[PDB]
Design a protein around this nucleic acid. Structure first.
Ligand SMILES: C[NH+](C)c1cc(NC(=O)CNC(C)(C)C)c(O)c2c1C[C@H]1C[C@H]3[C@H]([NH+](C)C)C(O)=C(C(N)=O)C(=O)[C@@]3(O)C(O)=C1C2=O
Ligand SMILES: [Mg+2]
Ligand SMILES: [Mg+2]
Ligand SMILES: [Mg+2]
Ligand SMILES: [Mg+2]
Ligand SMILES: [Mg+2]
Ligand SMILES: [Mg+2]
Ligand SMILES: [Mg+2]
Ligand SMILES: [Mg+2]
Ligand SMILES: [Mg+2]
Ligand SMILES: [Mg+2]
Ligand SMILES: [Mg+2]
Ligand SMILES: [Mg+2]
Ligand SMILES: [Mg+2]
Ligand SMILES: [Mg+2]
Ligand SMILES: [Mg+2]
Ligand SMILES: [Mg+2]
Ligand SMILES: [Mg+2]
Ligand SMILES: [Mg+2]
Ligand SMILES: [Mg+2]
Ligand SMILES: [Mg+2]
Ligand SMILES: [Mg+2]
Ligand SMILES: [Mg+2]
Ligand SMILES: [Mg+2]
Ligand SMILES: [Mg+2]
Ligand SMILES: [Mg+2]
Ligand SMILES: [Mg+2]
Ligand SMILES: [Mg+2]
Ligand SMILES: [Mg+2]
Ligand SMILES: [Mg+2]
Ligand SMILES: [Mg+2]
Ligand SMILES: [Mg+2]
Ligand SMILES: [Mg+2]
Ligand SMILES: [Mg+2]
Ligand SMILES: [Mg+2]
Ligand SMILES: [Mg+2]
Ligand SMILES: [Mg+2]
Ligand SMILES: [Mg+2]
Ligand SMILES: [Mg+2]
Ligand SMILES: [Mg+2]
Lengths: 92, 94, 100, 157, 120
RNA sequence: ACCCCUAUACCUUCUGCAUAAUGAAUUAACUAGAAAUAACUUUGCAAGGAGAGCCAAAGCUAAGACCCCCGAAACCAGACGA
RNA sequence: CCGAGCCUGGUGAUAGCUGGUUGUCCAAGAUAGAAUCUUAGUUCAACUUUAAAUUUGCCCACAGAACCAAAUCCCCUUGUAAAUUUAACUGUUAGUCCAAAGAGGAACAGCUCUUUGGACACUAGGAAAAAACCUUGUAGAGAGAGUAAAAAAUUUAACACCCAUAGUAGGCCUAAAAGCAGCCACCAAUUAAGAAAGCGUUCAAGCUCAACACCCACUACCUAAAAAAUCCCAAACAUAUA
RNA sequence: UCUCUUACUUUUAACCAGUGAAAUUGACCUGCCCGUGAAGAGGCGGGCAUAACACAGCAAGACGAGAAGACCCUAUGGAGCU
RNA sequence: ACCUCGGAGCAGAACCCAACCUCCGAGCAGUACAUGCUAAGACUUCACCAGUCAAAGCGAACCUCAAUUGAUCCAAUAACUUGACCAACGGAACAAGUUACCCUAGGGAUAACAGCGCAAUCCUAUUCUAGAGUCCAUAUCAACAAUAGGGUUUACGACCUCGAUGUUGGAUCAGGACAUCCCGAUGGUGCAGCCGCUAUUAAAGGUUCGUUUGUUCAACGAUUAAAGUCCUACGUGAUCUGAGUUCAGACCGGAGUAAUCCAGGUCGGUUUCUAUCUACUUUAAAUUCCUCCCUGUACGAAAGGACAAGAGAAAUAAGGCCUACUUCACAAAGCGCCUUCCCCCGUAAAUGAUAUCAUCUCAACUUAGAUACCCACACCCACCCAAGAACAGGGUU
């Protein structure tokens, strides 16, 4: 039922980012939570790396875009500074 | 009674193979995935003059890190401690 | 003499109609080394407009020309560089008029 | 094997699948459009000639009557001054329908022929009819009155 | 001879019916690609293998973010038959520092910054 | 235990061997990588080093670590054989 | 075991040739070529391996590369992490299929020769068994799960009915050539018949078609094989919602 | 000799008793058909067949055993002769 | 035949790129006499060797060409310089034939036989309708050409086999295909009958003996219903032969100085194997010819001359037995005797719709259209047997 799970947005493998695969397997009888599982720790580290990469790429492209905007403003101001420092004479 | 001359899938005379419905459906599925890839590649965000220099600092510092490692390759230290702990193989009780 | 697909082999005219030539022209065209047919001007234009009509009203979303020119699925690994211009209607010396 | 061969070369399987995918699909109509829903003017003026002229009309069945017998029977009827007209039913029946001789309509069906005159010389038309026995004298009209063959024989005698 | 393939700008010009088929705004384009390799580099040319290694798609079915910029787009245009490309959607925005440890990508291509494992 | 399912001995050779190509009945014993020039590593001393000789514009001295087995038809010398 | 006896010695003759080469575990690792009494070998290059030093290495933007097709060279970004140099050497240098561009041959070959690219000479799943086709690669345990490629479809030939006098044995040529041996013309009466479209006659004579009428209406799917040698080869099944 | 082979005797043979080899041998729990495959399958695929085990006989197969092909080519391998 | 060098195509656009691939050339000539010296930077025939361009500077002045070539040693010379068709052109200073008298190390990396791939060659079928057939394409034959199939020939390839896959014909035993030579059934005919020709169906059964030749083949003699075409490692040599062919001897003709050779002839010339495994070792329905009569009938002008039905007589094959004959003799045998039984499918017709006729119907429909054998079962020590290798079996009243 991978296509149906994809249609509902619940991955395709039922072992992918579900509560069934991400909730803790067990806990102590009196109620203390278990230490985190190795696979869940690895998945959280990978997701943190993924999110940091998303942030880095987004802000890098944004910074490049505003840098290009600033270069265009400098080009247009150097184009618009077109005052003749001396006044024409002669046949005028 | 019916022999394909030589090897079945090579040569002038080959054993014929015919296209099945599920093979056709598999190819149609991959074709749809690629048409969608064509669309999402057909819309770009920036242009070349806008992207001309937006990651040069990061690429340069990554290569400087690679250079730093390749230059820092060098033999490790040696220890009086390690040699005198090899002395311990004859440590008897009494 | 080399002869390619879609080339008139001989031409006929005069004070006559199609069926009269069509008899012995079909007789000759059957005996030719390649696939051949007796055509008139109206018959040839009818085949050409039927081919363009079939290409226009083809309901298949996927065509050989589109797939080959876009290199869909990396199909140019098994295709030929001349298939980009043949568009799947030609295979060696054989012409397939049913392909669009 | 070369690129051009005398036989149809076996394709690579991916190319064969490509052709089987890119085959042509004709448009399918929804409710199947099959399942979805000259001479007449000349023939008309000549029949106008023979009906507003030509008072005596006799309709007979055009029996086979081999060509020498056609010409001799025609030539006896022509020595005795009546004409043989042959005019087709497909232009003659609606002319009767809009020209009032609808009582003469249900008799012009099958092979038909007209023995027609401006002089009422019924005596030889019926004695030629007794000379050739397989000739019915279906019907017709004298002086714009519809008569059967009993009426024709009564008008003759 | 089998060579590299030059792919037309005509197939890479989009069309309006393509836009409503795959709903995507031509103005305000999407910023990041989710690229996922769905086909082996075996029985494929060495340049395609190299470009897969460059883009970092050695492991199949492992999604990767890339910039929607023309150079990365050219690489993906060369290697477009081995990958699936999706737009990276951000319903509740870019992740920040306090929500970076509670992210999930999801199969719809929507990076959520807050992940509870609780029913709605 | 069999019955079920899966599974084309090994070595050599070769583009490729289940190959109907080679070798092998089996057991026990015997039966096949020798070394220099340099380099590299670790010490000693250091514009010198080595217990003469030799090398030296950081070198010299010392150690470590690297080069198989069986097989012809033949050739020659001296004997022994009618 | 005399094309040159036998024995001992040189002798552990020599062999670009065959055979063999003995503990465990891990890692990198696949073939442009040039010379050669050389193509059964070797040396150099190329690829490969290890250790060092350094900085750029692959992918590539626009512009650029000649007169007489696919592409390539060059190449900043960009994505990435390799590359060059120094030191030390071994080994590979007897190659197969597939796709493509060609050449030779038969537009034969599991044929031979180049080039580009795969795969095989390393794993696993599939196409029946299976080197080379497709899917897939980085290694362990599991009596968990989602998938990839992945099962051949086709079955063909009915075609009318009825009718037919005649200007004339049109003219020329011929013994005659009469609608029909060959030529010119192709008018013309009946309601409607070609100075005749096939047959058929030495020539004639004959019988079909085109033509009147007749009438429901020309009903009109425009398609096409078979063989070999031990014994056919899964069993089967048209109809319960992808 | 053959058409066209038969009968008998001896040896051989088979059984009992005594003595007792050789070539060969990867391991074998060692079937048929069609197909496949290093292109001729007991061992692979599809099907079929199938309680176990001696003794006599046959020679179609095990590319059967023997002899590192007596023909062909190669070797900067020999030798005899002119 | 080629071996070294260059140009063009293959190799269309940076470079490179093979074939006993397609074409064209080269082994110099002419000018000059600074064609002197020297020196940054480069190119490079995929290595090296070799080769190529060149700024500036000194000194003067005010090379064309495409290849047009040869290393080291050594030799000549006072020196500068110069020496090979070393053309097998990266060159050994200088060496040919022959071997069937041969040997060794190997190779299925490489030929002969066989298999396999392919089908140029070979064979067959169909399409087309020129032409032949008095006329008439299609009774019969058939051009140009087309489409498809087969794997019997001659080739081509070099994929298994050279630590052996033994060979041509013949004997013996044959298995199979049908593309049928005969026997069976049917359609057409330029089929009156007898004979024929052609096509469909049929592989149950059969398909001779001799002379020459080693022959397969081929020619001839005599028959027969016929004397089939092929495949089976050109079936089959652990079943046989060895006439031929390609070991060692010899001769003839020829070639060569000779050794020796000839894809020429001739005489002679060793054919091993004790069977381990697979497989197999008794599955009863027979065909054909001839004779008589039908009948000198049908048919036919005559000459000629049947098919059915039926009767007899043989031959072969299969199974069996000895009464006689014969080899022989308590018995085994043939040369003798006895027995031997079903069909077979191509097509021809009737009724009748699609298509109110007609139509044999991939319309519904009608007609032509096996039995036999075997079968019970601790009497068994022993003896006998028509039963038998041993075992088993039958008899022992
Ligand atoms: C079988 N004979 C006809 C023969 C044939 C050939 N040649 C072939 O191989 C030909 N075979 C073909 C037809 C090509 C398939 C042969 O080559 C031979 C021989 C015979 C042998 C005899 C050998 C013999 N020994 C080994 C039994 C012997 O002692 C002597 C002797 N006189 O001393 C030999 O001569 C002998 O060694 C020999 O030479 C033979 C062959 O070479
Ligand atoms: Mg095969
Ligand atoms: Mg081999
Ligand atoms: Mg062998
Ligand atoms: Mg073996
Ligand atoms: Mg060998
Ligand atoms: Mg004496
Ligand atoms: Mg040795
Ligand atoms: Mg490894
Ligand atoms: Mg050489
Ligand atoms: Mg060698
Ligand atoms: Mg090959
Ligand atoms: Mg004994
Ligand atoms: Mg195998
Ligand atoms: Mg087999
Ligand atoms: Mg075996
Ligand atoms: Mg036995
Ligand atoms: Mg053997
Ligand atoms: Mg050998
Ligand atoms: Mg050599
Ligand atoms: Mg020598
Ligand atoms: Mg020597
Ligand atoms: Mg160079
Ligand atoms: Mg100068
Ligand atoms: Mg040479
Ligand atoms: Mg040379
Ligand atoms: Mg001799
Ligand atoms: Mg030998
Ligand atoms: Mg052969
Ligand atoms: Mg004719
Ligand atoms: Mg080869
Ligand atoms: Mg051999
Ligand atoms: Mg052997
Ligand atoms: Mg037949
Ligand atoms: Mg044979
Ligand atoms: Mg044999
Ligand atoms: Mg010999
Ligand atoms: Mg003698
Ligand atoms: Mg023998
Ligand atoms: Mg066996």
């Amino acid at each position: 039922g991978g296509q149906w799970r994809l249609q509902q947005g619940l991955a395709a493998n039922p072992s992918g980012y579900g509560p069934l695969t991400e909730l803790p397997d067990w806990s102590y009888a009196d109620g203390r939570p278990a230490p985190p599982m190795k696979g869940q720790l690895r998945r959280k580290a990978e997701r943190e790396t993924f999110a940091r990469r998303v942030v880095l790429l987004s802000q890098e492209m944004d910074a490049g875009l505003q840098a290009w905007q600033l270069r265009q403003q400098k080009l247009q101001e150097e184009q618009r500074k077109q005052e003749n420092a001396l006044k024409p004479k002669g046949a005028s | 009674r019916g022999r394909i001359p030589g090897r079945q899938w090579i040569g002038k005379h080959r054993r014929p193979r015919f296209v099945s419905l599920r093979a056709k459906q598999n190819m149609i599925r991959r074709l749809e995935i690629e048409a969608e890839n064509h669309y999402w590649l057909s819309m770009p965000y920036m242009t070349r003059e806008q992207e001309r220099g937006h990651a040069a600092v990061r690429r340069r510092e990554a290569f400087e890190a690679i250079k730093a490692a390749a230059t820092s390759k060098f033999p490790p230290h040696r220890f009086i401690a390690d040699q005198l702990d090899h002395l311990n193989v004859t440590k008897k009780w009494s | 003499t080399p002869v390619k697909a879609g080339r008139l082999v001989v031409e006929m005219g005069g004070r006559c109609e199609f069926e009269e030539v069509q008899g012995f022209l079909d007789q000759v065209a059957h005996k030719l080394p390649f696939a051949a047919k007796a055509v008139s001007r109206g018959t040839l234009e009818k085949m050409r407009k039927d081919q363009e009509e079939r290409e226009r009203n083809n309901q298949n979303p996927w065509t050989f020309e589109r797939i080959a020119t876009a290199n869909m699925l990396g199909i140019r690994k098994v295709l030929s560089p001349y298939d980009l211009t043949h568009k799947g209607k030609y295979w060696g010396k054989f012409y397939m008029p049913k392909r669009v | 094997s070369k690129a051009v061969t005398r036989h149809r070369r076996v394709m690579h399987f991916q190319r064969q699948k490509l052709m089987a995918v890119t085959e042509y699909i004709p448009p399918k109509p929804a409710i199947h459009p099959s399942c979805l829903p000259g001479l007449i003017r000349l023939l008309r003026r000549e029949i106008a000639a023979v009906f507003q002229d030509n008072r005596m009309i006799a309709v007979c069945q055009n029996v086979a009557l081999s060509a020498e017998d056609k010409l001799l029977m025609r030539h006896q009827l022509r020595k005795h001054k009546i004409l043989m007209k042959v005019f087709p039913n497909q232009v003659l029946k609606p002319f009767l329908e809009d020209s009032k001789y609808q009582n003469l309509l249900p008799l012009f069906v099958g092979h038909n022929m007209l023995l027609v005159s401006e002089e009422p010389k019924v005596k030889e038309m019926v004695r030629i009819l007794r000379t050739v026995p397989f000739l019915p004298l279906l019907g017709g009209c004298i002086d714009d009155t519809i008569l059967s063959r009993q009426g024709f024989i009564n008008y003759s005698k | 001879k089998f060579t590299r393939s030059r792919i037309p700008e005509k197939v890479f010009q989009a069309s309006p019916e393509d836009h409503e088929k795959y709903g995507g705004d031509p103005q305000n384009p999407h910023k990041l690609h989710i690229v996922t390799r769905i086909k082996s580099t075996r029985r494929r040319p060495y340049w395609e293998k190299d470009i897969i290694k460059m883009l970092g798609l050695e492991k199949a079915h492992t999604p990767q973010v890339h910039k929607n910029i023309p150079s990365v787009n050219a690489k993906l245009k060369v290697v477009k038959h081995l990958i699936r490309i999706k737009p990276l959607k951000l319903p509740q925005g870019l992740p920040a520092e306090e929500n970076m440890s509670n992210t999930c990508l999801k199969s719809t291509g929507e990076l959520v910054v807050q992940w509870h494992l609780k029913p709605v």
